[model samples]
Target chain A: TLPQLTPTLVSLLEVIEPEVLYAGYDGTVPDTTWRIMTTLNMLGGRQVIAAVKWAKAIPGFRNLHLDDQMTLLQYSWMSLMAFALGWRSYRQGNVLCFAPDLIINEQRMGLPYMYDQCKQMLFVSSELKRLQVSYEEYLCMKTLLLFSSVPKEGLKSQELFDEIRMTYIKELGKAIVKREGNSSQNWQRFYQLTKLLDSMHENVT
Target chain B: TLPQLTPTLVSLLEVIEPEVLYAGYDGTVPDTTWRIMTTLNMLGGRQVIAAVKWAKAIPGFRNLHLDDQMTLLQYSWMSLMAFALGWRSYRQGNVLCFAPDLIINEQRMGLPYMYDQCKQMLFVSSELKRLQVSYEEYLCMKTLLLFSSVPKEGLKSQELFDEIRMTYIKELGKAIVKREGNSSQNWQRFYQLTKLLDSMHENVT
Candidate 1:
């Protein structure tokens, strides 16, 4: 049986994942690079904006002060981007298939440290696939990232934000235990998956 | 004596670090969080836009096709952001000083994985300070990030992009050897500083 957070998570996933299939790159175009760039820019921008709106629609999200909302959004956007990218490429051999023809490999970019960045991403992608993570798990992970605030200098209501964030985390932990039967192994894997954010943060920046 | 790349690096650094000091958070305000968020958004956005202009003003950057230019900009912006953030926070003990009143500690944020993220950033920050990285070195590293292009799937002119990226990397290496002497130790340190981008990337994301 799905946890209580399932419905909200499913709705959020709709905003994040949108469709099962994204339009692949058009190789036939003469200006393939331009087309692909435009497509990616549009898709990335659209999804992020949609995600903000979806988050705002969540039960308690709108009730937070506007400053809190924006703070959360600013800190959370990249993690969501990483999550979306990982999800899109999960079953595709870790090739970032942004579009049909536009699959990206880490080596092709020729950036100095990018090889390590790409490798870390591929590792996480493969792990996600291997674990056969469920939609509920994915949602919980997303919530964890979204609510995970970095202490910024000068926020008075940090305690308030911290409370909200921890509440969600606790619920996520409960869901994991319920679903995975309270085994240490299952909990350990869950922790690893969430910690993947550190690496994901590295990859995007 | 500075390396041959010194003049150009100085110029780029001017563009990257126009403000000798940035305004810190006003904790006295009731909406401190909102103000800081706005300041950060503006600062991050302004620097990136300036970086794009500075890069475009480079000799051969304008010659690239419009599409390739956009692709490079999209791919390089985050790394540049990480680079700038690391540089600004290096002496401040990697506390992420977004404002004068606001210094951030990862522990205060209360996220589970943030401890590792913060530690990695602090390590990189300390290393940069310890190495006493010069402006020229910093400039070369920035250029490397700007020019480094990871292979994107479906890019028809992959070879062309790779060639451009390698040329910059070569120049960066030469500058490192010229300024720091040709010792393996110095060279190794240079390599470590550049690789710090990987951790910086994680910190931002």
Candidate 2:
């Protein structure tokens, strides 16, 4: 059985959790196209901002050099955006909800590029749901993305940063193992998580 | 004809240029597979680190808040790597040279995933060659990638960052228009460049 959740992890989830409501749009509206575009932009901005605030709240994050902090954020924002989107995805309905009243169906977007992007995100959402990823695991996954190291030319204090990043990754791995009991399924689930994050990188640009 | 290259742009290229020498391995060697993987990792690390250093050297970059610097880097790294790879690709020979001597042919990697990734990169490289993208244009394209913005929340001074980013992007557009004499090809080539960068993001992940 999985170990009891720690207070720190619990608070991290609350801090990073997206605040928007999840609701479907009325496709019959006269300006549905414009509405969807506007809603998406608004939600995207909100999600990114929320992620930044969440990162800031992480203990020791604010203490890093300003450049190091920016480097991590620069590398992390898209993956977090995708993760938030996937977490809220309605797997059965094949739709993404940006707000309590603003959901978008793939075909409803009108633009092929937008539709294709949404389709990829929905695929990832379905996979996550299929794996039955827990909220704790989701939090751990986001933490991993936030601390992922990108090689920099003159990273003055890489060792310190690496130690912090590895601690989170290790904690997550232990949580997964404890929860899943070291079965092949545990490994498979972790692999799926990595692939899902990669898909986000592939689709975001 | 392309206008004269400015000293700043010229220096930017040299600063951002990948440092490793490219060489090919003899597939017949027993450790060829391991050697290729090691070489790729080393080169990839070098490229990302070089990119970080390059971003730091941009005139107003250090003046921005730490978060903004990171936001730009996060979004730009893969495209820059792709640009570097595509720029160095040998189109006529249908191979990618990592160093002067290290050339990769799709099949030599002996892995389906590696082969597929190489094929995609080669396609982008060829498209760039076909467009005859000038050195100045190439530098401008890289500049645009480095400064490209993704919307965020709680960005305390986004307006300032946006102004700096726009200046680079606008300069790029003007340079392209000047070089191509404001014809449809100018716009077409720009579109193609964006698509190429998108493909990089698509493939790199």
Candidate 3:
């Protein structure tokens, strides 16, 4: 535990957070394939681009092999968006916040994928809200998700990647301690929280 | 003034307002043309699409020919964004609130168009702030802007268009009266708020 970097790393997460985006969905309009496609892709562009901007700012992220960096992001972008979406859905209670501009009340999520897919994402939010995930735990867990997978062929800097991954695991543990202390179930908290990502459907996302 | 419709129209505006969109800008990144251009377009898409949704709900907007509807939105969309942008800029004092999420402080706005172009838009906001224009006045004036332009060939429902245009003009006057209460300078208030768009550099937007 480089007790030093943990603070700066977690602090940085707060700073780089993207501005709220709007879904740009007009709920009252006829639900055509084109309308659904347009809203989905338009909304997609906002989140996708922001994720790229965000990855570039992760502390040691730029230190990775250039190709490796893109590879990690490609693998993780959707999960990244899914989690944030869950966090928003969990917080908003009833509405699905695509971009704060166009919220989907449970009923308005009538179009394909958004309705079905959002239901799954809603479950992720419910799980998170149940966990009462602290912001710090959420940030560390989000970063750890980036490092979860690797090309079987492996990264150009596998050693560095492994070390960076381990360091965040330690940071995630520390973040939990800050929340739970050593009192009771500290170990269980770490086990359950890491599972929190798995519950997010990260593998398929 | 149809007391019946005036309240509904202005009230409808309040209801139909788009949720706040974020700029999704990363201030920490290198100020390359790509980053600037991408952020501009990303932010642009959020506001642009919502404007279309808003037009559709404008009571009589859809009653016109499909072709006429697109033409009006085409002519008026930028002005629509400009005034709303001005309102946010004025409220923020020094920053431009593109979306509540991504605020551009004056110094960071260095790229083409967003910098110099925004300065012109800033003047519109400042002018509105100076007018102390009420929310009701702002809504009706914005409605007037949609009806301000006409193609040389004219819309299919030119008579209905004229009626709608004149109706909003009356609505705007009423909004001003509600604010000024037939007090001194009631006419001056109407004259200035209508010009509010002109000051916005709407013709060129």
Best by DockQ: 1
Please give the distance, in angstroms, between residue A65's alpha carbon in candidate 3 and its true position after superposition.
22
Q: Which of 1 and 2 is the better model by lDDT? A: 2
- Predict model 3's lDDT versus the native: 0.72
DockQ of each: 0.06, 0.02, 0.01
lDDT of 3 by residue, B156-202 (tens): 98878887778788878788888879877998887788766665433
Report the C-alpha displacement of residue B200, candidate 2, in angstroms. 22
Interface RMSD of each: 9.9, 14.0, 16.4
The Cα local distance difference test for each model comes to: 0.58, 0.63, 0.72
Output the worst ten-in-a-row residue range by lDDT, candidate 2 chain B: B108-117
Candidate 1's error at B171, in angstroms? 16
Q: What is the TM-score of chain A in candidate 3?
A: 0.84
Model 2 Cα displacement at B140 (Å)? 32
User: Which is the leading candidate under TM-score?
Assistant: 3
If both were scored by DockQ, which would come out higher, candidate 1 or candidate 2? Answer: 1
Which rank order by DockQ, best down to worst? Answer: 1, 2, 3
Range of the 10 consecutive residues with the lowest summed lDDT in candidate 1 chain B:
B108-117
Model 2 TM-score, 2 decimals: 0.45
Model 1: runs farther than 4 Å from truth? A1-25, A30-35, A99-124, A151-167, A197-205, B1-205
